[PDB]
């Protein structure tokens, strides 16, 4: 089993500091700085931050779990400057793209030596500091680019975003791939299992790591409830953490007695001078309709309106004269004049950046935003209101999770300006003190990993000789997290000192999980030509590895069965839209033969893959796999590639625009990848075809610049 030694240090109240180190190396604590400081700060650093800096000085990796808005980004800048002092290179992994652009703008303002990498652009890569997403770094680690041998400091933001299902593999794999001679920082939110994470990093790098945890916060919050029609906000918990359910009981009584509302709430808020306010509604039509309702009011002067017109024009002047004549632009601009804004992943990103900037200024007070602000921005406010607790994620129409409740509440509270922040929660249902308590005061949800094996992983790992998957699985978090749950039946057996479990769980104490899926993936790869006996690659593998933005087995089969070799330029774009697009729509479309026929061959190949998957028992279903690919935008993309107008396009489908933009950007990425694949096998007509399609897509707005850049 993994031997590991964890320890605590004698410090003062304000935080908690604990180390995790190899089980056979004694502990000699950190040492004070030597010489000048890397970056002097105008103010005085908390114990939290100065401990982080003291750790970063002695060249030791760290974990930092503290609520947002606590200047958690200081350790990052210190590390960056320290690296730029020793000629080293440093890296900053931010999954989001817009957050990455913001961090790049900041680091560029400050240090003048930075470089951005992202799916859309690339800047000054010969920079001692590289800001970018994580998947880029994954591809690097695979292809051992010229960076891993130079960068000594990595810094991760939003590891808690690893708790998801579709992307929690990336951060893990990246960590497993980094070399022992690296150092790096983790900047998370509150998570109670930090000790396990640190032990994992240690046993994984044979390196010591530090952990800082604190509930500290500069702007304490006050939570209130609003029941339907109560016309009165009821306190529940106070700054001091004193939860008083007396008012909560009164609120429930009002609920029971009850048997154009959020408007009333915002009017209250503004009469209280509690502005500005954020509004978290877990949908899109609701946000938009609330904005429509509240258009009547005005929370700005006239000079502010002229100034907003100025900035808005200076921003959307980068577009054409026609994209200006777009219904969203017009039908929104007055809402911005009036001081209310809306933000959700269904807009054009131009207006999104515009609104985020305006909010950073203060030219809009009430903002209807669902979950974007919750994660990837530093733009706090004075008060926040939850339109309702319920939401949708994955499949379940679950209640709100304390983790997300707090991730959003952290928004409220502007340092300096606001002596405190006002959270409010709307309710229209009986909710006894248990659920309300575990929601409001309950602690965050732990950081469990997903670590679902994937094709790309297996193939890109078969390329290599020194690294094999079994290693990956035995080094992951999903495995290291199955050694503190082991003592249970092990303790039962120790008592027994039943024996069936003894034999089995003793031969399964330090063993591997999730192997059967690995063997089945291998079997598929063999049956389809993507590998061979002896577990070695085949041409198909070196064609699929180049693809990462979609299902690559089926793309390679489409190639090696001769589909794109007979079609035209755009039809390929459409058949790829059939993959990037993953949303449902109301009305399935009617498609012409020239454009539909190919999809039938696509579905035949899909059925073949499904049968080959079922033979090996991947617990897979056929109907889903086949229907997981929505062609609802084939005609959209066709007409777009014919060189048409975005307004002549947003109509054909009852879908928002931002989804189209995401579709098309992923599509262009996939086209670059397919060009490289054709470049690999040896064909040229196909790569010219795909490149021409790319040249057809990018016209006006799907690939505009980021105002933050």
């Amino acid at each position: 089993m993994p031997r590991v030694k964890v320890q605590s240090v004698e410090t003062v109240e304000g935080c908690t500091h604990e180390v995790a180190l190899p089980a056979e190396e004694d502990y000699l604590p950190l040492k004070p700085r030597v010489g000048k400081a890397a970056k002097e700060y105008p103010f005085i650093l908390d114990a939290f931050q100065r401990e982080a800096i003291q750790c970063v000085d002695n060249n030791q990796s760290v974990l930092v779990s503290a609520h947002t808005s606590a200047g958690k980004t200081v350790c990052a800048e210190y590390a960056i400057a320290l690296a730029l002092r020793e000629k080293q290179r440093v890296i900053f992994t931010s999954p989001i793209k817009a957050l990455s652009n913001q961090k790049y703008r900041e680091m560029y303002e400050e240090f003048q030596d930075v470089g951005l990498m992202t799916g859309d652009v690339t800047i000054n890569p010969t920079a001692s500091c590289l800001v970018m997403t994580t998947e880029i770094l994954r591809s690097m680690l695979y292809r051992g680019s010229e960076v891993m041998r130079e960068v000594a400091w990595v810094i991760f933001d939003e590891i808690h975003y690893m708790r998801d299902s579709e992307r929690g593999v990336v951060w893990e794999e990246t960590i497993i791939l980094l070399p022992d001679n690296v150092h790096y920082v983790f900047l998370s939110a509150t998570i109670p299992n930090a000790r396990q994470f640190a032990e994992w990093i240690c046993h994984l790098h044979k390196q010591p790591c530090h952990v800082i945890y604190t509930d500290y916060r500069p702007t304490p919050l006050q939570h209130y409830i609003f029941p339907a029609g109560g016309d009165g906000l009821h306190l529940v918990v106070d700054e001091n953490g004193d939860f008083r359910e007396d008012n909560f009981n009164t609120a429930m009584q009002v609920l029971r007695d009850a048997g154009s509302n959020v408007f009333k709430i915002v009017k209250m808020i503004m009469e209280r001078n509690f502005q500005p306010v954020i509004i978290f509604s877990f949908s899109k039509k609701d946000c938009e309709a609330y904005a429509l309702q509240m258009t009547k009011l005005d929370f700005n002067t006239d000079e502010e309106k002229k100034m907003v017109e100025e900035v808005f024009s200076n921003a959307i002047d980068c577009l054409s004269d026609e994209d200006k004549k777009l219904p969203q632009v017009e039908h929104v601009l007055p809402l911005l004049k009036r001081g209310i804004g809306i933000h959700h992943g269904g807009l054009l990103p131009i207006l999104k950046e515009t609104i985020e900037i305006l909010f950073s200024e203060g030219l809009i007070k009430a903002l209807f935003a669902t979950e974007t602000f919750a994660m990837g921005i530093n733009m706090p406010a004075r008060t926040v209101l939850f339109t309702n607790a319920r939401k949708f994620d994955g499949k379940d129409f679950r209640w709100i999770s304390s983790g997300e409740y707090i991730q959003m509440s952290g928004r409220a509270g502007r340092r300096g300006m606001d002596d405190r922040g006002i959270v409010i929660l709307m309710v229209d249902e009986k909710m006894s003190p248990t659920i309300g308590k575990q929601l409001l005061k309950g602690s965050a949800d732990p950081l469990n990993s997903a670590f679902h094996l994937t094709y790309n992983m297996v193939l890109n790992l078969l390329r290599v000789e020194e690294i094999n998957p079994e290693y990956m699985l035995e080094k992951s978090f999903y495995q290291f997290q199955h050694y503190r749950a082991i003592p249970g039946v092990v303790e039962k057996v120790k008592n027994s000192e039943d024996i069936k479990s003894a034999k089995r769980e003793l031969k399964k104490a330090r063993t591997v999980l999730q192997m059967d899926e690995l063997k089945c993936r291998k079997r598929v790869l063999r049956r389809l030509g993507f590998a061979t006996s002896s577990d070695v690659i085949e041409m198909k593998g070196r064609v699929a590895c180049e693809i990462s933005s979609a299902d690559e087995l089926l793309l390679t089969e489409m190639m090696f069965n001769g589909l794109f070799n007979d079609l035209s330029a755009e039809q390929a774009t459409a058949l790829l839209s059939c993959f990037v697009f993953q949303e449902n729509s109301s009305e399935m479309p009617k498609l012409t033969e020239q454009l539909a026929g190919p999809l039938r061959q696509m579905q035949e190949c899909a059925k073949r893959i499904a049968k080959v998957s079922a033979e090996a028992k991947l617990e897979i279903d056929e109907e889903t796999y086949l229907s997981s690919f929505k062609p609802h935008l084939m005609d959209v993309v066709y007409t777009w590639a014919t060189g048409a107008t975005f307004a002549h396009i947003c109509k054909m489908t009852d879908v928002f625009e931002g989804s189209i933009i995401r579709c098309m950007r992923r599509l262009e990425e996939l086209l670059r990848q397919m060009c490289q694949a054709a470049k690999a096998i040896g064909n040229t007509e196909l790569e010219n075809k795909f490149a021409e399609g790319i040249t057809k897509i990018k016209r006006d707005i799907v690939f505009a610049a980021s105002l933050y850049l």
């Binding site: 020793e86 000629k87 080293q88 290179r89 001692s128 292809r143 051992g144 680019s145 010229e146 041998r149 130079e150 960068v151 000594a152 070399p179 022992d180 001679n181 390329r463 290599v464 000789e465 020194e466 030509g529 002896s534 577990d535 070695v536 690659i537 041409m539 198909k540 070196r542 590895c545 089969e557 090696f560 069965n561 001769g562 470049k679 096998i681």
Partner: protein
């Protein structure tokens, strides 16, 4: 030619699902993307090293690629540009793995870990590249008392 698929090289034909290729019996090493490799150096250019594989061009090891003594990794400066010679003499041998293949045909190769790099004294043989099975773990350590 004239809507007719005409061979170009002597060997056996191979028909993958819809792709028709040929697998000659003697060729010079075409560059793959993960294949390990052994190479004898030929030149030392201001920026990089030029290496000789049984390839149709002069393989390339960028100064950025070669690992450094131990793990003392900060960045590459002019001092490294001048040690570019005193460490990797012209004529020496390197056991690397490919990094990428350029459109001009050349092969840029690197050193993923410390198991790779420069080689000791040992001995060497030069055979044809079409006589090594494409498989895994080219690095063997045999019971006879040696390694290959």
């Amino acid at each position: 030619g004239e809507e007719k698929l005409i061979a170009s090289v002597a060997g056996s034909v191979e028909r993958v699902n819809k792709l028709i290729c040929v697998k000659a019996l003697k060729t010079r090493y075409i560059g793959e993307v993960g294949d390990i490799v052994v190479g004898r150096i030929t030149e030392v250019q201001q920026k990089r090293w030029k290496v000789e594989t049984n390839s149709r061009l002069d393989s390339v090891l960028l100064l950025s690629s070669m690992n450094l003594p131990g793990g003392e990794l900060r960045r590459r400066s002019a001092e490294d540009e001048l040690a570019m010679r005193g460490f990797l003499q012209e004529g020496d041998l390197i056991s690397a793995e490919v990094q990428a293949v350029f459109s001009d045909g050349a092969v840029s190769l690197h050193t993923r870990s410390l198991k790779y790099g420069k080689l000791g004294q040992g001995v060497l043989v030069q055979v044809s590249p079409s006589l090594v099975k494409r498989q895994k773990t080219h690095f063997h350590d045999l019971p006879c008392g040696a390694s290959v």
